[PDB]
RNA sequence: GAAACUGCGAAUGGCUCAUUAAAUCAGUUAUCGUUUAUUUGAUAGUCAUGGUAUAACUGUGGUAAUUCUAGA
């Protein structure tokens, strides 16, 4: 191609999206936004294929013009808005909230969420830097750019952010024996507490994690996402608690 | 110049002031297959199950929990009359628009069921209602304006005879909102009391009109 | 003998769409293929609603017959229905009117002609009129 | 003159009766009675008279009838409605006449009055079938013989007090009026082994 | 472009196309179960080949291996859910022992002939294509249904059929019409 | 609301594998050696408001002819 493409095949979609082969040749190519391409979800696939409330693009389009849903308080009117993991979805006329969070089945997962939990949101600080005029700041995993954070925080760090001000509620460091979500990889969604971290200078650092059934596995730090302390999640968790069984 | 030549698209922008200018009240100049007018178990209960189907707002769901525990019949209305009305006005001053449409509808059918004995509730209901109108003016909802004044015309149609006997007091209950310095508020209240005026009989007409004359010379300053 | 029983399943209110979605299940024993107008009538009566706000579609009688299943919708009023429904269904229910137009072919070649046309063209018409007069 | 006013008036008479009955039991509870009406409309097991009964003094009375091999009996008890307030019975001369409808293998349905609890059930009326309701075709879906012709087995009175249905080994369901015991309709089962067992 | 809809040939030709023993096998089974087609025989035998092949694979697999346990359970439960494998025969040797005659019995035309709703197996297939018997509530005009146990209890005539249900057919009604016409004449 | 100016797209889609034998492709990198329209999130104290136009349009024209144009 002599540039980017506007087109997305049916089979070209990520497998976790659970979209059939037969009701289309095309998947809706998601627009650019916070998250990256394969670990997102368009809102129309969210609504029609999970919430089932609309069945057509004209329907969901009319809804977006009806200005209902606010993602983190902000409405989008984009159909293919790239909604990713750990997201707050606010439903006014139905009076609900939804945390978008990975499935034990490796898929995504809606979560029925109250207003107090929707008031804030979580974020993996991925890069702390020093900006122009010597201003210190961070960029999270969801692309939130926050000036002037607490100096004790470093990269990859879990931060509770109030959405209502878009401000740093509090933070959680990266220690062993912290409750961690795994975002990507084969074992994603399997919530566990970190055993430790095999570190490599310049290399992909591996992480050993043990979960409640005393089961240990190893993923990469990119998949690693700390939630909270032991028995202390800052969020409400869905059924199964991220536990793989037979 | 307003919009006289309708374009082809299905969706006009339709600003709030234009909505206000197009809005009218009278359901008799309207009509429909009203559910309370359609099934005749109880009007309040019919409207309540209808809005229990329709509305999904947390204010109204807590309200509906309490009231669907309380009342399931017309003797239960006649028994727990006060408590359900106090919970009504509680959520009414809890001020949720999503619950404000169905709660106003249940207020209307609650008066339609409780007619002749409602007036004691109905007076401070007028008070809280005009407070809610001022709250909508702080807000910006032609829908809420429409719901409130439709409820007002409903209560007038339901309780006409006692109010055409006691007409000049009902005027006094709305005079601060008739003399309120908003032309469309005055217009809507004028439409509702105008329905009542066209309903009222001749003796009460002459009495009420003469008292309006003296009220005019009292408020000789006001032009609204 | 024959009793058209109109039943529903999976009823969800969509207040965002200000309607109710439900799977319609028709039992018409000693009967075949009752019409959607009557179905909308009975459904509007059952849900205390108005037939124009009621919409039914996509119906399939089972193998053999006597039972049909499809899908139905009822908006909270005629205004919701009019503002939300597909126009072909609105025409199908008579609410909208079938627009008349040229074919896609006539429209295509017409657009091509007018696309080769530049400007408004009345000046061109006067010029070619006087040139044919020449 | 208005139906809402009439409903309210019936509710006024209802609550007057409720408060007078409250004064009678006295010689809260009214709302408890309202909740009892709602539980009657729908509820779990609420009638808790499992200890107030006096079984040792329960007066017994056997009634031998001429008809042989009784199969079923259906009692109609008219109850006062909660939403409307007239009755569940249809007529005015009934006024809550407790009815019984017995079907016996001699092809006989018999209605009794059981309106009193000290007297005996009075044989109000009857209707008996026979072999003249034997059908002519014997091989078709049509079984519209107005009377039964073989081995009635079960009966059920409609709750509105208008009709009574009967079914038996002649694979038919004949519904009759409850006063004249006239066959208002008959539904064949359109079967070879579709014999009526029990009604609900 | 689209997605390729997956499909399959449901059968396979035998190795030697001509052998007297198998020919008489086929003739006996065909006139036995009212059948009509070598290709149908190839279908059912192909099913048996696949199933007992995978069965032998499980036999070669090691005992108490969870894959073996899982697959044996699934195969056995599907067999007994159809009604082929019996309750007492719930082991892999019996799964190896299952046979095309059992499958031909579990076929529906055989089963309704056992139920005696037709004088012949062929007569049963006739009634099948006349659509006069519904299974459970569902009318089926396919004689090769391979029913389950509940369903073979649930075999009954069609309520639209003139036999177990609705009005008689066109032949009966036209003969009654001509007979009424002649008697009124 | 024609037309016209302005904006953006028109660097995808669809068709074919001519060519090409460490080339592509595949896996595995990495760019602390590059730019990024767009999305998104942040981000700026350091005249009661000049001018030039030109389309569209009016009007005169060319030719055998084109989604040609010229003058004004």
UniProtKB/Swiss-Prot annotation, chain B:
It is found in: Cytoplasm; Nucleus, Nucleolus. It comes from Saccharomyces cerevisiae (strain ATCC 204508 / S288c). Involved in nucleolar processing of pre-18S ribosomal RNA and ribosome assembly. This is U3 small nucleolar RNA-associated protein 20. The chain holds residues 4 to 227 of 2493 of the full protein. Belongs to the UTP20 family. Interacts with snoRNA U3. Interacts with MPP10. Component of the ribosomal small subunit (SSU) processome composed of at least 40 protein subunits and snoRNA U3. Transmembrane segments: none annotated.
UniProtKB/Swiss-Prot annotation, chain C:
Belongs to the eukaryotic ribosomal protein eS24 family. This is Small ribosomal subunit protein eS24A. Its main location: cytoplasm. It comes from Saccharomyces cerevisiae (strain ATCC 204508 / S288c). Residues 104-114, 123-134 have a biased composition (Basic residues). The modification N-acetylserine is found at residue 1. Keywords: Acetylation, Cytoplasm, Isopeptide bond, Phosphoprotein, Ribonucleoprotein, Ribosomal protein, Ubl conjugation. HAMAP family: Ribosomal_eS24. It is found in: Cytoplasm. SUPFAM superfamilies: Ribosomal proteins S24e, L23 and L15e (SSF54189). One of its GO terms (molecular function) is structural constituent of ribosome. Transmembrane segments: none annotated. The keyword Cytoplasm applies. The keyword Cytoplasm applies. Component of the ribosome, a large ribonucleoprotein complex responsible for the synthesis of proteins in the cell. The small ribosomal subunit (SSU) binds messenger RNAs (mRNAs) and translates the encoded message by selecting cognate aminoacyl-transfer RNA (tRNA) molecules. The large subunit (LSU) contains the ribosomal catalytic site termed the peptidyl transferase center (PTC), which catalyzes the formation of peptide bonds, thereby polymerizing the amino acids delivered by tRNAs into a polypeptide chain. It comes from the Eukaryota. The modification Phosphoserine is found at residues 13, 55. There are 2 genes for eS24 in yeast. GO terms for cellular component: cytosol; cytosolic small ribosomal subunit; mitochondrion. There is a cross-link at residue 20 (Glycyl lysine isopeptide (Lys-Gly) (interchain with G-Cter in ubiquitin)). InterPro entries: eRP_eS24_sf, Ribosomal_eS24, Ribosomal_eS24_CS, Ribosomal_uL23/eL15/eS24_sf.
From Swiss-Prot, chain D:
One of its GO terms (biological process) is maturation of SSU-rRNA. It comes from the Eukaryota. One of its GO terms (cellular component) is box C/D methylation guide snoRNP complex. GO terms for molecular function: snoRNA binding; U3 snoRNA binding. Its main location: nucleus. The keyword Repeat applies. WD repeats lie at residues 147-186. Keywords: Acetylation, Coiled coil, Nucleus, Phosphoprotein, Repeat, Ribonucleoprotein, Ribosome biogenesis, rRNA processing, WD repeat. Present with 5130 molecules/cell in log phase SD medium. Involved in nucleolar processing of pre-18S ribosomal RNA. Required for efficient pre-rRNA cleavage at sites A0, A1 and A2, and biosynthesis of 18S rRNA. Belongs to the WD repeat RRP9 family. This is Ribosomal RNA-processing protein 9. It comes from Saccharomyces cerevisiae (strain ATCC 204508 / S288c). The lineage of its organism: Eukaryota, Fungi, Dikarya, Ascomycota, Saccharomycotina. The gene is RRP9. The chain holds residues 57 to 287 of 573 of the full protein.
From Swiss-Prot, chain E:
Signal peptide: none annotated. The modification Phosphoserine is found at residue 183. Keywords: Cytoplasm, Isopeptide bond, Nucleus, Phosphoprotein, Ribonucleoprotein, Ribosomal protein, Ribosome biogenesis, RNA-binding, rRNA processing, rRNA-binding, Ubl conjugation. SMART domains: Ribosomal_S4, S4. GO terms for biological process: maturation of SSU-rRNA from tricistronic rRNA transcript (SSU-rRNA, 5.8S rRNA, LSU-rRNA); ribosomal small subunit biogenesis; translation. One of its GO terms (molecular function) is structural constituent of ribosome. The keyword DNA repair does not apply. It is found in: Cytoplasm; Nucleus, Nucleolus. Residues 159-185 are annotated as: Disordered. It comes from the Eukaryota. One of its GO terms (cellular component) is nucleolus. CDD domains: S4. There is a cross-link at residue 179 (Glycyl lysine isopeptide (Lys-Gly) (interchain with G-Cter in ubiquitin)). SUPFAM superfamilies: Alpha-L RNA-binding motif (SSF55174). Residues 106-180 form the S4 RNA-binding domain. The keyword Ribonucleoprotein applies. NCBIfam families: PRK04051.1 (NF003139), uS4_arch (TIGR01018). Component of the small ribosomal subunit (SSU). Mature yeast ribosomes consist of a small (40S) and a large (60S) subunit. The 40S small subunit contains 1 molecule of ribosomal RNA (18S rRNA) and 33 different proteins (encoded by 57 genes). The large 60S subunit contains 3 rRNA molecules (25S, 5.8S and 5S rRNA) and 46 different proteins (encoded by 81 genes). Interacts with snoRNA U3. uS11 interacts with MPP10. Component of the ribosomal small subunit (SSU) processome composed of at least 40 protein subunits and snoRNA U3. Belongs to the universal ribosomal protein uS4 family. Present with 106000 molecules/cell in log phase SD medium. There are 2 genes for uS4 in yeast. This is Small ribosomal subunit protein uS4A.
